Design a protein around this nucleic acid. Sequence first.
DNA 1: TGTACAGTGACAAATTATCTGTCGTCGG
DNA 2: TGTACAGTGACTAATTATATGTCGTTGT
Lengths: 514, 507, 110
Amino acid sequence: LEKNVIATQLSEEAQVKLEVIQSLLEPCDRTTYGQKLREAAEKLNVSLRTVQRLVKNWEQDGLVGLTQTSRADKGKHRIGEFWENFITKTYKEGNKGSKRMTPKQVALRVEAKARELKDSKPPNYKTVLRVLAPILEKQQKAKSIRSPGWRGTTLSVKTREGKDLSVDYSNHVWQCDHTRVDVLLVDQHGEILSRPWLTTVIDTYSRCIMGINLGFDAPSSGVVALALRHAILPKRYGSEYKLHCEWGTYGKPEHFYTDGGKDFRSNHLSQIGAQLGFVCHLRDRPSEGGVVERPFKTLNDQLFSTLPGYTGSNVQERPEDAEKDARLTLRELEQLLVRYIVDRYNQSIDARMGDQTRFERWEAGLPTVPVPIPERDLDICLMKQSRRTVQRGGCLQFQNLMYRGEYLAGYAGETVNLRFDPRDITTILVYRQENNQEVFLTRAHAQGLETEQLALDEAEAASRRLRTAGKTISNQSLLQEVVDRDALVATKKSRKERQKLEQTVLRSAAVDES
Amino acid sequence: LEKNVIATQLSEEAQVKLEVIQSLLEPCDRTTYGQKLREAAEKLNVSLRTVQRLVKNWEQDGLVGLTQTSRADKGKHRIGEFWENFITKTYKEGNKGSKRMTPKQVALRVEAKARELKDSKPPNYKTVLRVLAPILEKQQKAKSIRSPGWRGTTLSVKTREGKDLSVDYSNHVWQCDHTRVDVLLVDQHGEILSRPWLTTVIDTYSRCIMGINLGFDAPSSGVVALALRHAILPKRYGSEYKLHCEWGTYGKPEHFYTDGGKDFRSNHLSQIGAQLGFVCHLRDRPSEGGVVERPFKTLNDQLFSTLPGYTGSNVQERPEDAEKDARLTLRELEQLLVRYIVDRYNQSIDARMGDQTRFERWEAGLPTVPVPIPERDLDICLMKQSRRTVQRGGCLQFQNLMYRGEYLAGYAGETVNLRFDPRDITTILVYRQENNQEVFLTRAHAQGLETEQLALDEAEAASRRLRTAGKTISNQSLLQEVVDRDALKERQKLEQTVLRSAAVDES
Amino acid sequence: QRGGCLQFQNLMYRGEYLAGYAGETVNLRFDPRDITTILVYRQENNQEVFLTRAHAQGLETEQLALDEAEAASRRLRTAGKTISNQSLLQEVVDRDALVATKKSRKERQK
DNA sequence: TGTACAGTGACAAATTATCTGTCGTCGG
DNA sequence: TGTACAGTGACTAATTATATGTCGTTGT
Ligand SMILES: [Mg+2]
Ligand SMILES: [Mg+2]
């Protein structure tokens, strides 16, 4: 084991004592000790015994023997031990759970106990503040602790299962999460809508952003599936994005690492994982998600805080003009956000490295050039209805719609896996199991509405209105209920319901991409 | 103007110059003074001309003439004006409206313009911070500015009319506004309800709290009417409040001063004010009404922060256990809050004075002891229906309910002023205009409901349900649309039940 | 830093008994001829007190001198400066500033 | 003149470990 | 070992108003 003490900058009295010690450092003759000790007593204006004591402190200890020594009672209160423990316990107990008691309130409890004990001289307010001083101080360091982070090139990710998985190359481990964007948006007229949701997908080996989905829709496994589709497929943008670089990323993960939200623990994402072959993993804590969490802070600082309609990070920062100053449509925010991610964010230097651009680290990081996946083969993203049973005459029933198709009647009594798109359920793909291998059977079409379209949400909402009204349900009556609601909304003086208008602007951006 | 300057912290070099000047205070002779200069040139390691300059700097400035003055460039920037104006206005434009541009982002705009102009030395980010530094300190100072306060016995309350009310004595100007308390309360079963609303009525002259209302209920001209009657009437509290002094505070204001909430700028408070004879006055800014507002910080600091279920003053300071650690019901919180106001707060020192309690100053500050008003005469709190007309058959129809009155058939076709209680609309007081004055006529009653009590929000909720149910309008039909929804829960009804249990304990 | 870590010359140093001092300030002493190991001292009223040793982590085994670590650090700074806030990284800043500015729709009436 | 409670600089008093004299004791 | 950007001490280079000599000029 080891120990040492070193003097800090000497005080002026300690400097003088240093000159006296140097005056007493040379001699070898008892006569010269006597001479220089007596002149040192005169120089310090002290007794000869005092100079002897000073030399002995510098002999048995360092320069810290000729600096002053602090008192033994420094940091001990002179009030009784009962009172110091009473003040300490009263403060701590006053803060259990939701309660928040101030030192002044503690002082009132001290005075109340003093009346019970008939103590004419209890600790006053300043003494209570001093007694609680270190208790309040420690707290202020514990809240502020910095984490070292990782040093680079070697990285692993801690899962909620307690397992640590390494990250070895680009597209080894993707991560994803959603946020509100801190910007208010307007419709194509200039009336306010909502703050949109931004979903990002990001590669853990390179920190390069793989894809995004920006829209008014609340988070869902459908939103995660749209974001995976954009991440995975090769990307191209028209001149209206004004890009100078290309996003240039594509291909599919080996693992997908997420929060514990229902969106990522949904059966829909699990079916996407099994078809594309990328097992999912839940993060242990939000602090393990640093690679996906931090980019939202970076976007707030570099991008969103400069745009009209900025709402601040939270209500306490909200500019009073945030609703007076909203101007961007969703299509215009996406033009800005994609220019930023392609020309700026993915072109910045990768932290934990300093040598490499984030994209260059993705591209050089690849084990091999990934083979592009044809867009039609992201049909895997369709939801599966785990079974339906082929009824007599080849019918299937799904969400109250009745479907028939080109071969189904030969399979009556079997169970088939319907695979469907929630954006348009008027046609469904039917798959069956043969030799424990799922195979394609046919496309099934909702009888009598093959020329229409219906999202699953329209069919579900119209079905509730039919059940509430007490009317029967069939393909024609369900279709009539849907087109009648859109006609009734068209009679409204605003033609607005929040979702109908947010969907109109979102769909207008979605179908302007081509 | 006068123009003086004084030196401080002189010594560090200057004591050597000071000792030189002390050696030179007198032109003793042309022969000897030159020798004193040539001697001082040993203490300062410098020529005769440096010592002659030192003596001239001393004689023309005094002690600051010993100290080295700061350079003329101090606080000026060498980057040139173009860049100094570009950097200053870029920051300012980028923090316009909702934008909050950082100096780093300003530096990026500097590099962008320098690239356009083919400059080679666009100011460095460290110098951008320095150039923007002065206009950041100003912003921080302009937020931090303290205001003094009324000092002594003289006080002039500013209104939105630019008129000031001179507050001369107790009950001259009361004040009121509302706020949330910062504690989550529970029902009598221990499940979460919501954070109550607290109303306070204060007298401006004494700063004594003259009345309160605490409840889950919403700010409304009803909650203001209830705060008014609790303030005006003599106060009684039982032993379960454990009070050791009395809230001996009552009587009628001459003026009532408020924020612009719809509770206060309302016909209902106008009619209360005209019948009680007090004038309604509007607060010009939140910062004029500190006598109402500041009771609320003191209560957070002295009372509510020390109670379980405390929620903080805002969402960034919310204790994460607040939703799990709630324990008090509305009846406990009132039994604590009333004690706090009677034993502590009204008994503490009036801060403007230092030598009176808030209650002592109120009681001594009355121009005379006011007579207690009869509890029946607080029927001026009853809401007014201004212009309903008597139908043939001696009838009045009102919020779907139909009413019959003892002389009312004499006045079919005439117009009547109806006074009613939102807590109990089974009965209506009917007044009519005669000789251009109101005269009382009769106590009309909802026919077939004389044994029954309906509050206005129940008749309203029953009417909404009845309209949407497609059933007919009648006194029972409305009662039928109450008694099921009664018997069969929704937070507002659960809140109302706990609020009712407190009102029961008031009886 | 947590777990008893210190940063010096861009290397990360781990202290042997240091972990209880996270969030505290310490001072430190080393021989410029070899900065693979650093001596950590606590600060007190007139004295530094020797606290523990600390060793460099993630580096090569060969003993690291101080001048050599400065050199490694200027090679990183030189490499970073080759990506000289390079023009792509700024060209965006005008167009971000000019999709805004152009959209003055906050209060436009007829 | 918005406002009033809790936290914070500035100063004074009682207590105690620490530095100084003076003398006595022991060693060279 | 969460994660990566904006603000910040600590040090250095370029520019300048300023302190120091040296001599010429004038007043005493
Ligand atoms: Mg999340
Ligand atoms: Mg208000």
